[PDB]
Amino acid sequence: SHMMTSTAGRTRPDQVLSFLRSGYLFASRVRRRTGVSPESGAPVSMNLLGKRSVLVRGEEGVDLFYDTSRMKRHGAMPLFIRGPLFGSGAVHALDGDAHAARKNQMADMAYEDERVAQYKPFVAEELEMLIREWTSPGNVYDGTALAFGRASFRWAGIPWSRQEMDRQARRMSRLLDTFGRPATHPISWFERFRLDRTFTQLIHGVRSGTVAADPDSVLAHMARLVDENGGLVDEKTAAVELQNLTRPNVAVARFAAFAGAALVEHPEWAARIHEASQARGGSLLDIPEAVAFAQEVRRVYPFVPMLPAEATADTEIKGCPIHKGQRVLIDILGTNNDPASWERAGTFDPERFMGVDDAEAIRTFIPQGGAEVRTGHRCPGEKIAVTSLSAAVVALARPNVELGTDPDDLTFSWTHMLTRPATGMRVRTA
Amino acid sequence: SHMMTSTAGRTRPDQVLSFLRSGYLFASRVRRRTGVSPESGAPVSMNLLGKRSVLVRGEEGVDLFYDTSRMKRHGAMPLFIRGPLFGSGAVHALDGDAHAARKNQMADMAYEDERVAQYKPFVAEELEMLIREWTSPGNVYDGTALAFGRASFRWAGIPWSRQEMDRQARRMSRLLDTFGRPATHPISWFERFRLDRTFTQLIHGVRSGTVAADPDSVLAHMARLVDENGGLVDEKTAAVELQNLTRPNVAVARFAAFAGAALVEHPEWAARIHEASQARGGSLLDIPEAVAFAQEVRRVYPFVPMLPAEATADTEIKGCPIHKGQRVLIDILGTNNDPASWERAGTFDPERFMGVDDAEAIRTFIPQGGAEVRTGHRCPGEKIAVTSLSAAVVALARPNVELGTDPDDLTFSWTHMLTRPATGMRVRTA
Ligand code: HEM
Ligand code: HEM
Ligand SMILES: CCCCCCCCCCCCCC(=O)O
Ligand SMILES: CCCCCCCCCCCCCC(=O)O
């Protein structure tokens, strides 16, 4: 790629400030800045964070990004993100054998169908209680963040009161809501400090016998987390990874707020989801129309803009050379809405997921990563995430669960990260 | 120390957000929050950035902080500061033998009296040209940042045009002006990226023969920078340390803006400085009244709030225990204005420096560090800094150099870091 931004002698400008000012529009801006259409699939080379980087898209980009023989993750994610959001020693930054042993112990807890089945009754119960709590007006983001958190903490077997679960869920949701914007970024570190302290004392309590934990519970498995040689990990690392199995479910509240606005904008799907639920006695769980609607929300609405990796060897993609040690960025939002692999890519239409047997197998559907869960860095919690979101979609599609319709409930900024309706989508139960 | 902020079971709150909201008032706030007067010298224990920390003051605090047998600097400064401001591999983070060999090579360039004498004619010339440039109205911060930068680049022997010197000085001044506030913080990284690139290509040019450099010049000595075993350092490290010998002189523009406001607030000192200069034919250099005025500016006006170090062994100070591995913070602003070691500490009075032979020997005068330059981490550029500031004080004290008197020229916020008059002190030459 080539930018005609300045003279040949002057180095091409770093894109860090463009990225922050444009948010989820950055990929389309850096594309037209190199002379290609925002709907093109050609790689875009740039300087980002003082490092040569290539923005890739589509099936070719996914195949390159998740080839562990050519890509590493250690040091690819800036501390601005991984520090507050993932924590020290997290699986996100591990490679090779250390990652495989860590990722399998965590996929055992979040990705296995038996474990996901254990999560379903908790989120269903918490969402039903949230509907009753919403007789006093609230908003979807704050409300489902607490319901998701309580569901995750209960599912994990953590012996906390509902008051303590709410406190930790609220703090996780605040961390997510503040880390991506430089003005509020220090707030996310503040939450990370006290979350780490709260969860380290929990792992310390389970290992010493002060805090009871079912031997097969997620809490206990994290307290018994070992490295690739069978050695027990530090209490802080075990606490960091327990948060990584709970906080990202709290993060689904953002998808639930997006889904409330989409339900307002697509009332024929709301009624269709409601009717499908009523046929099942009103159940929130495993409603095919809601699952499809949830999937189209994950595809269309912005959350993860892109992901970084560092090249371990010289390679190339579609003619663009990639030097060893430089950054490779996979366009998440652009791949999910790529006209090259999606029919009517710019249209919100959940029908594209109706009748799909294995959405995970769609190689260009990567809102939470691509390739394989256990052999790569793909999110191991997609089944829990879709369970949380689809159940929330059903609850919000109830006509007695009245969603707000003001411009602050339905619109959001695309130039900030992360983003959501400013109100969080107001809601009240009749 | 003890905070009665919440219940005993609830952990004491981290002070990170209090520090950012209160800026240079943080030390006085954390003191009264522990039940002591803001003018007290007792140590204050706290949680800062998720780490137990002790804020020390006065002679006892200085003796503790600079005892290298009990304190290390590696990892004590957060990346929020050292990343943009100091650069990777800088002397600020080195300890032991690596620091001694690095610090002596840099003190040879900035701290030696012969080198400082070589700097004087450059800043005197640049300031005289700035006075003539100010026939078109400007401001002290922006103007002296360029004059100081050109003086430093010329003194160092860098073969750049005046246009290129201005460009790099402007970018250093922007970095300083933006790094301390979370909203503008990413701008400082942006400048650090292109400054590092500009100065790495300079070191690369000198080492390869593309760029000429006097063998005894500061530029050449940095291009020949070696580690503690005689091994040549990387081109980026040599470029990082060349910036550390030039950018901090650009930073003196902030003191020069403070000094302009002080000259307005203390007109009897302005006229006294002007008369002392006129007696010397109008010289800007080595005017005792201006030197004293410059020193009192460094003492009273806020720049460095405090400095961090990590304890290498268990120790104590005034009854407060210090655990190995925790943080120790030396109150810079509080020590410089401590009623325990300063007569009328809250009063701006340059007479306290009139007749002082060795201000460096005043143990509680630490605006740019304490203890010894070569054996510790004390600033090696205080003589250059005082030369730059005192010469600027003389120039601004000229009645034909008319300083602005609006509230935006004379006041500034104490709750932001770094800080200065919002206009930069407007100024115009008659
Ligand atoms: C809105 C909800 C979620 C979003 C947007 C999301 C997105 C992502 C993304 C983009 C990645 C990185 C993929 C890669 O590195 O290639 C990731 C990784 C991860 N996710 Fe999720 N995810 C969500 C929900 C969850 C849930 C519910 C869990 C656990 C129950 C979870 C646990 C993890 C873990 C542990 C990783 C690191 C895996 C590794 O590095 O190997 N996430 N997530
Ligand atoms: C307004 C101007 C300045 C201020 C506020 C300032 C302040 C400081 C402070 C507080 C330190 C750390 C002391 C410690 O770690 O104990 C420091 C270190 C340092 N300063 Fe300055 N200084 C200034 C001017 C200069 C100048 C003019 C130079 C060079 C010509 C310079 C070069 C350095 C270097 C290289 C260090 C690191 C030394 C080490 O870590 O051993 N500074 N400065
Ligand atoms: C240079 C890379 C910039 C883009 C980084 C975006 C990372 C977003 C991760 C979002 C993860 C949500 C789930 C969670 O961990 O709580
Ligand atoms: C936790 C420590 C917070 C305080 C850190 C303050 C550091 C300020 C350094 C200012 C140096 C100015 C000279 C320069 O390097 O350009």
CSV table of N, CA and C in Angstrom, one decimal, chain B residues 168-213:
chain,number,residue,atom,x,y,z
B,168,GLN,N,12.1,20.1,15.8
B,168,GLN,CA,12.4,19.1,16.9
B,168,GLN,C,12.1,19.7,18.3
B,169,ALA,N,12.5,21.0,18.5
B,169,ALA,CA,12.2,21.7,19.7
B,169,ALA,C,10.7,21.8,20.0
B,170,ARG,N,10.0,22.2,19.0
B,170,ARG,CA,8.5,22.3,19.1
B,170,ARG,C,7.9,20.9,19.5
B,171,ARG,N,8.4,19.9,18.9
B,171,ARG,CA,7.9,18.5,19.2
B,171,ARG,C,8.2,18.1,20.6
B,172,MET,N,9.5,18.4,21.1
B,172,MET,CA,9.8,18.1,22.5
B,172,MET,C,8.9,18.9,23.4
B,173,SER,N,8.7,20.2,23.1
B,173,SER,CA,7.9,21.0,24.0
B,173,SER,C,6.4,20.5,24.1
B,174,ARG,N,5.9,20.0,22.9
B,174,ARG,CA,4.6,19.4,22.9
B,174,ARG,C,4.5,18.2,23.8
B,175,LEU,N,5.5,17.3,23.6
B,175,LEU,CA,5.6,16.1,24.5
B,175,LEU,C,5.5,16.5,25.9
B,176,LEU,N,6.3,17.4,26.4
B,176,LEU,CA,6.3,17.8,27.8
B,176,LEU,C,4.9,18.4,28.2
B,177,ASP,N,4.3,19.1,27.2
B,177,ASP,CA,3.1,19.8,27.5
B,177,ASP,C,1.9,18.9,27.6
B,178,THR,N,2.0,17.6,27.2
B,178,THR,CA,0.8,16.7,27.0
B,178,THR,C,0.9,15.4,27.8
B,179,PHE,N,2.1,15.0,28.2
B,179,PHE,CA,2.2,13.6,28.7
B,179,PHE,C,1.5,13.5,30.1
B,180,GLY,N,1.5,14.5,30.9
B,180,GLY,CA,1.0,14.4,32.2
B,180,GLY,C,-0.5,14.3,32.4
B,181,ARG,N,-1.3,14.7,31.3
B,181,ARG,CA,-2.7,14.7,31.4
B,181,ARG,C,-3.3,13.5,30.6
B,182,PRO,N,-4.2,12.7,31.2
B,182,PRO,CA,-4.6,11.5,30.5
B,182,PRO,C,-5.3,11.8,29.2
B,183,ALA,N,-6.0,12.9,29.1
B,183,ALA,CA,-6.7,13.2,27.8
B,183,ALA,C,-5.7,13.4,26.7
B,184,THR,N,-4.6,14.1,27.0
B,184,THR,CA,-3.6,14.5,25.9
B,184,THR,C,-2.4,13.5,25.9
B,185,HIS,N,-2.4,12.6,26.9
B,185,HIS,CA,-1.3,11.6,27.0
B,185,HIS,C,-0.9,10.9,25.6
B,186,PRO,N,-1.9,10.4,24.8
B,186,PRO,CA,-1.4,9.8,23.6
B,186,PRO,C,-0.7,10.7,22.6
B,187,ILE,N,-0.9,12.0,22.7
B,187,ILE,CA,-0.1,12.9,21.9
B,187,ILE,C,1.4,12.8,22.3
B,188,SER,N,1.7,12.6,23.5
B,188,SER,CA,3.1,12.5,23.9
B,188,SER,C,3.8,11.3,23.4
B,189,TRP,N,3.1,10.1,23.3
B,189,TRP,CA,3.6,9.0,22.6
B,189,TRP,C,3.8,9.2,21.2
B,190,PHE,N,2.9,9.9,20.5
B,190,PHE,CA,3.0,10.3,19.1
B,190,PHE,C,4.3,11.1,18.9
B,191,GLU,N,4.6,12.0,19.7
B,191,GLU,CA,5.9,12.8,19.6
B,191,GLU,C,7.1,11.9,19.9
B,192,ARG,N,7.0,11.1,20.9
B,192,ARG,CA,8.1,10.2,21.2
B,192,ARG,C,8.5,9.3,20.1
B,193,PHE,N,7.5,8.8,19.3
B,193,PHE,CA,7.7,7.9,18.2
B,193,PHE,C,8.5,8.6,17.1
B,194,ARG,N,8.1,9.8,16.7
B,194,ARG,CA,8.9,10.5,15.7
B,194,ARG,C,10.1,11.2,16.1
B,195,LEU,N,10.2,11.6,17.4
B,195,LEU,CA,11.5,12.1,18.0
B,195,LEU,C,12.5,10.9,18.0
B,196,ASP,N,12.1,9.7,18.5
B,196,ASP,CA,13.1,8.6,18.5
B,196,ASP,C,13.5,8.3,17.1
B,197,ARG,N,12.6,8.3,16.1
B,197,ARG,CA,13.0,8.0,14.7
B,197,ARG,C,14.0,9.1,14.2
B,198,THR,N,13.7,10.4,14.4
B,198,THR,CA,14.5,11.5,14.0
B,198,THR,C,15.9,11.4,14.6
B,199,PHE,N,16.0,11.0,15.9
B,199,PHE,CA,17.3,11.0,16.5
B,199,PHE,C,18.0,9.7,16.4
B,200,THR,N,17.3,8.6,16.1
B,200,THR,CA,18.0,7.4,15.8
B,200,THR,C,18.7,7.5,14.4
B,201,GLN,N,18.0,8.1,13.4
B,201,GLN,CA,18.7,8.3,12.1
B,201,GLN,C,19.9,9.3,12.2
B,202,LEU,N,19.9,10.1,13.2
B,202,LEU,CA,21.0,11.0,13.4
B,202,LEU,C,22.2,10.2,14.0
B,203,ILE,N,22.0,9.4,15.0
B,203,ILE,CA,23.1,8.6,15.5
B,203,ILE,C,23.5,7.6,14.5
B,204,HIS,N,22.6,7.1,13.7
B,204,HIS,CA,23.0,6.2,12.6
B,204,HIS,C,23.9,6.9,11.6
B,205,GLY,N,23.6,8.2,11.3
B,205,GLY,CA,24.3,8.9,10.4
B,205,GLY,C,25.7,9.3,10.8
B,206,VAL,N,25.9,9.5,12.1
B,206,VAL,CA,27.2,9.9,12.7
B,206,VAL,C,28.1,8.6,12.7
B,207,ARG,N,27.5,7.5,13.1
B,207,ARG,CA,28.3,6.2,13.1
B,207,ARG,C,28.7,5.7,11.8
B,208,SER,N,28.0,6.1,10.7
B,208,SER,CA,28.3,5.6,9.4
B,208,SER,C,29.0,6.6,8.5
B,209,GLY,N,29.1,7.9,8.9
B,209,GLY,CA,29.8,8.9,8.2
B,209,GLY,C,28.9,9.7,7.3
B,210,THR,N,27.6,9.5,7.3
B,210,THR,CA,26.7,10.3,6.5
B,210,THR,C,26.5,11.7,7.1
B,211,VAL,N,26.6,11.8,8.4
B,211,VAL,CA,26.4,13.0,9.1
B,211,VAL,C,27.7,13.4,9.8
B,212,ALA,N,28.3,14.6,9.6
B,212,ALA,CA,29.5,15.0,10.2
B,212,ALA,C,29.3,15.4,11.7
B,213,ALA,N,30.2,15.1,12.5
B,213,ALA,CA,30.1,15.5,13.9
B,213,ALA,C,31.5,15.7,14.5
